[PDB]
Paper text:
At_RND contains an exonuclease domain and two HRDC domains, whereas At_[name] contains a single DEDDy domain. At_[name] forms an octameric hollow cylindrical structure, which allows [name], ssDNA, and ssRNA to enter the central tunnel where the multiple active sites perform hydrolysis. This novel structural feature accounts for the high processivity of At_[name] and its preference for longer [name] substrates despite the lack of HRDC domains.
The apo and metal-bound structures were almost identical and only minor differences were observed. The final model of Atu4108 contained two protein molecules in the asymmetric unit. The remaining seven α helices and loops surrounded the above-mentioned strands and made contact with the other molecule of the asymmetric unit. The C-terminal loop extended into a pocket in the second molecule formed from the α3, α4, and α7 helices and the β6 strand. The α7 helix was slightly bent in the middle to better accommodate the C-terminal loop.
Numbering used by the authors:
A (entry chain A), C (entry chain A), E (entry chain A), F (entry chain A): 2 to 208
B (entry chain B), D (entry chain B), G (entry chain B), H (entry chain B): 3 to 208
The structure:
Amino acid sequence: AATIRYHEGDISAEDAARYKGAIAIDTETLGLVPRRDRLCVVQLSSGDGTADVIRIAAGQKQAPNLVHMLADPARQKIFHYGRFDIAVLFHTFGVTTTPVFCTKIASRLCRTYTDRHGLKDNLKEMLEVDISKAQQSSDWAAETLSPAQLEYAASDVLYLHALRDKLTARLIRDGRIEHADACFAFLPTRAKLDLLGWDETDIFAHS
Amino acid sequence: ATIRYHEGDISAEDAARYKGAIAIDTETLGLVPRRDRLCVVQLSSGDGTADVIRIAAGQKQAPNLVHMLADPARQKIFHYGRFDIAVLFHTFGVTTTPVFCTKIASRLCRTYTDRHGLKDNLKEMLEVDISKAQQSSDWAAETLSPAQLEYAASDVLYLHALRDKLTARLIRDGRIEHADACFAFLPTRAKLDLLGWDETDIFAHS
Amino acid sequence: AATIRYHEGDISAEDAARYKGAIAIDTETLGLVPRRDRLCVVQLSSGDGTADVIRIAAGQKQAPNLVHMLADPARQKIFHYGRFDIAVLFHTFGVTTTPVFCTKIASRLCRTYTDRHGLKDNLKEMLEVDISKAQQSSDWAAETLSPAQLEYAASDVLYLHALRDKLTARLIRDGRIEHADACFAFLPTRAKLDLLGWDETDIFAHS
Amino acid sequence: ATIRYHEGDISAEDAARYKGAIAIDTETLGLVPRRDRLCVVQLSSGDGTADVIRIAAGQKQAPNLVHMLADPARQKIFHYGRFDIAVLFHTFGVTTTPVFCTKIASRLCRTYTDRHGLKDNLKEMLEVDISKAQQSSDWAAETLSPAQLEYAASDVLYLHALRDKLTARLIRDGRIEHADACFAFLPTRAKLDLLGWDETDIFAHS
Amino acid sequence: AATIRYHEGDISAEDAARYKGAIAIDTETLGLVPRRDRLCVVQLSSGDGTADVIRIAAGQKQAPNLVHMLADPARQKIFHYGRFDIAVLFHTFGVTTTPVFCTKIASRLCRTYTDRHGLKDNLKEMLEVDISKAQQSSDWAAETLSPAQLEYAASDVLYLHALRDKLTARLIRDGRIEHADACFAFLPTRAKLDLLGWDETDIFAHS
Amino acid sequence: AATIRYHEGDISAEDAARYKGAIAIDTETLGLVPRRDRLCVVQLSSGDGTADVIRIAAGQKQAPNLVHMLADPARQKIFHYGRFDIAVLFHTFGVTTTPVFCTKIASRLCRTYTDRHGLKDNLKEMLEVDISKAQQSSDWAAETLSPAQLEYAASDVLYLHALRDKLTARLIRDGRIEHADACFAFLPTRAKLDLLGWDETDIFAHS
Amino acid sequence: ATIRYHEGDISAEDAARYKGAIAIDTETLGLVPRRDRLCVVQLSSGDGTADVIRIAAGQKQAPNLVHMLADPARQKIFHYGRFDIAVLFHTFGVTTTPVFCTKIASRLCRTYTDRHGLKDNLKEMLEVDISKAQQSSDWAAETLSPAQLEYAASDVLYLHALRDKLTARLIRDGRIEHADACFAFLPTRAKLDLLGWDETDIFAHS
Amino acid sequence: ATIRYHEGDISAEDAARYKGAIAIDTETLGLVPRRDRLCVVQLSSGDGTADVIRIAAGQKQAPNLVHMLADPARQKIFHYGRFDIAVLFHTFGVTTTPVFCTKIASRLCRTYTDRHGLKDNLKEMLEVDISKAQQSSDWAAETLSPAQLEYAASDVLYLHALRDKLTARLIRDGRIEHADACFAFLPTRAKLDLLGWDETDIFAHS
């Protein structure tokens, strides 16, 4: 019945069964460099106002119930800036998350009247929802996640279905849903190119 | 006879020579598609001959060429297709598909150099020499010169061979799947450029 | 009698008849790239403390009463940074707005003691009028403009006659009215050069 | 006899040769008008001959030249008039009008190159070769050398022909009206430079 | 008896006679480019807590009582960033102000523990005096200077003797008084080089 | 019994005897350029909540009790950004401080989820301790240090043992203690290379 | 006979030639170790001969080479060891120690020049000429060419001599102790690069 | 006989040749005075001959040279004295005064060029050719080579003549008083550099 369902290592089968459709997802790590900074938390939400928070142990390389969800082509995974998380999940578990919807790419493609494409600003404008970023820069490898860390992790996925729905309607209205879908199809490759060593260059540029 | 010249569109007879992949480049009045009109489209089937099609100011149709560009059964090979795909969509409304880009391929496998232009690729990969002297000529000239026609043909005459060599390197070095995904995105990348995202990576934060 | 007169598609003939002289004008769009971001609103004021707000539909390419006002050489159009709006109006309707007075160019030419040439700062110093920029970055394509969007649109044109008058007096006092008038005569060409593809370069520079 | 040399001002007799447009350039002690004085003004009527006028330190009048510069009935042709118009206004108080600038014209039509200098324009458009060797000489020298006089004349001898070729390109490519509006603004752009706006586009936000 | 003695055109002989020693001085203009932006106000203080504020008219090229003070080698002129004001005064009146003490140069040479060398920060640290910069960016050519403009002009010179005295003691303590004096001797040339056309380059650099 | 024990010139033998293990240490100077800006204060703490504050006189080149502590290989010296202080101490006294632990290097090596590696931010996150930076940019050469300067100097060393202990545990947890120890072994050379003339280049780069 | 070629690992017999310091360089597919695989390791004992070891894709062991790299009794000499030490650790898991880097040495003593590459060092310090023509070749080629083998050997043949000359300069100019401390840190600097600190000095504020 | 070589200090006999202005330059181990020691001081009286003084590591005195440098009755001529004045103060504690700097003079009068180095000044102003080949040599060498001695002498042999030509231009173009004030500040500018203000103009806001 909990708003924040906590797991160690992997999601339970009962909680994975809550996800009959799209899966909202984010991760927390020790930093922005996957080969240096380990995966610490994976958080998920089915869009019903509750979330799963999964603590990932140091050195952990399998999470079979979660990994099946990530690879399942029948269920879309929704991220805000999936470029990073898709890379972290491939680096850690060897899974290519697919198919994906990225609300940051979607924001860039339809919220053409602003330069503010972060999650907090998207949720404020599109949903009139306030989230706090205070815990983004904390030690996510802690043995005991703090109440504030659990709040942040859950709130970071609780609103992604609703945000995707609003941005999808804007993309359809403004004629860019096809462009968005092509971006989402390339996103796992973009993440893998980062891991391989092209993380600071646009492969489509001249240089 | 190795450079077949056409006004406006390739003939149906010459289009029928293209039984497989189509090497393609364009020439324009500059690097800004909405400012700098398409002036030439050049094609080769990889048999050592080329078709050079001169495009008129204001021309909006080229039915035989457009059918080739849209034909999903025949790959189109470009060097830096990001630009030409945008120009072709801007001019004719056609989305060229499917594509292979030898510049993207070069960037993904020739990791030991920063020289990814066509001339350098042709020299290293094929020992073929081309001259870039006519690159900055007036492609809207009333009469294209013999030097211009030779330059335009040379930009397409070797793309099948270059594609094959770079594909072998992509296989050897493990990046053929990444290259194919880049090629699948390339028409969208070109369309995003036309809409004013030309100086930003849509996959970056900004 | 309304302070904010609302129109769909075009201004009414009765309201266009209010403009016996200069026309204060601005636009709202989906962003700063005319070939990508459609025109959404045109707002006008005759300088009497009231404004016309005209919602422009997606795909709309004619607005005959408005376009006649924009092209009428007998009535000056007053913009703050007309470089953008003149381009948007030419892109959308094919009209070359003329003649124009730009209060941003005027500010740059006479308010030589400051680097703050935006509308809010000009209105504060020159008129002791406060305006809020909160709604500048909103979805101007909304089917129902919000009360805050209507306030912003109206306030954005309500003070331009008064601002033009103050800046004109400063330009005369400080000896730069001729320079300003030459800038205003070039402004439609500058806007058209942006649309053609020179939007990021000064055509008068070496490169 | 093809380079007519004058001290201070052109003679009335030689000014009367100019029945139409006046090609014009200047030489100075550098690129900062309030620091670097005007040293030479060079003119050509487009007939293959030039007038070279040497300007003295502190000279504030040149009545025959100033009458030509202000005469609204005769166009003045410059390559990058933005600079010379400023120098002439700073020195003599004259606003040169009306003007044609071949550098603005080049930027508006030679969209396929970044080379908009005079030497490159003359080579592409006219197959005329000029040498820039004396560009960085001391133009305030007590005696101008034959090389300096040849350089100064060559900067004006071809501007009518270059104007005509670039005008044809502006017609072909649809930008003659934009060019004319730029020329109408150019004297104001030059005056804004003298006032300290030389490093900013007055039409930008900043 | 006034704290702020106002003058039009030139200081009176009676008020110039108050200055038996160093003269604290600043100017106000229409901006930072002397050939474009006219001199509007010259303000002076003898260090006794009162100031002279002299309005300079458009086109005015003489101010004989003031100019004698500026040129008088027997009385030091104290500026905060005299590089600018010395240039403006030479451009306007043809006078080379000498000798000078610049409290900004002095601050840079002895307040080596901070990057904040403006007047407000110097007065706060060295004298525990607060001044407001609100009126720095105002129209100084106004026919009627506002009460706030008069306050700003006076406060800008009221504390310069005291600031010079504190910074002089620091320069002596820390061994850099000779360097400071050499900088002050070069300052009029530095100002003149700005007017001539070297305003954006250090003449002592390679380029 | 004092929380802040004050010394002129050198620490007393009795107070040096308090340091049976690691020595927390910082300095204050007239600025960031050792050849220009003299050493003014050395502050130490044994980690018991009290500190020694030693005023260094102008021109002073010996401090034998302090220098013995700095050179003693049996006692670690703990700095936050020791690169600077190690250089200042070598420049002033000729002593090579060794061995060292730098909490800024340690922070950069383990607090990989943040870009905020200053002392104030480290103490806030790692210890929930607040310090004020108000007095960092003050005149540290004053004959009479102010109460606020004494507070700042003491608080700057009071928490370094505790910070070192927390960061050491993080470095061990995250696998980078060996990297940190190698950085600390190079740190005196890095400081000396700064003094010699390589202060603006990484000697390990290509250029 | 002066270039001994090996597949995969140096032979035990040839490793036994190395009684003292070991000059070493590598060749790769580019400058990003996790992207661009190790292709060649080249060694010299300083006797005018070299061992060139070609490394296979996916190769993770080279026992004789790794024993040399880890042997604390024999110094390894590199020019810009920061890169090669990282590549060797990434590929084989070995931490090369102890090391001398002639590029660090050059930066610490050749204070009158910005030219710290190997070719310039060899020319000034030894009057030895090497050519960099094969620097940007495909080092993963199925067969390394004679030019590639000569280039690879020349990169190690002179490092003992260069080390000796630069050591003399470090003694003369007072920086040998600083150099030795840099060499002691160099393996850590290389490991920090692999972890993503490659564009930051860990000793700076940021 | 035209290059008189000295160890440590000029002889009293050769110092007595200098009855007027003293042309002077130095050579060092690089551009950072506290890192890169003074190695050579070269002087000329303007008579076509030079004194070259080799400076030892750690040398802190040179009494005859220092007396010349401090002598207020004899001007010292440098090209970019900002550097050498700092090196001489750092090494010997002497404040060289009074000075003329031909690089400052060049910047104040050769307003039509960005080429203010010595070689370019000597070529334009005197038609004298010097070669910069030894600029980046090891000036702390145990034996200075004939090429080094020729380079060092050539840096001072023409400074009187260059000073005279640039002074004439400063007179012509109205900036001799500004130049003299710059020269009066130059020793302070050099001392501020040594104190860490070397990358900032003390007269700027920051």
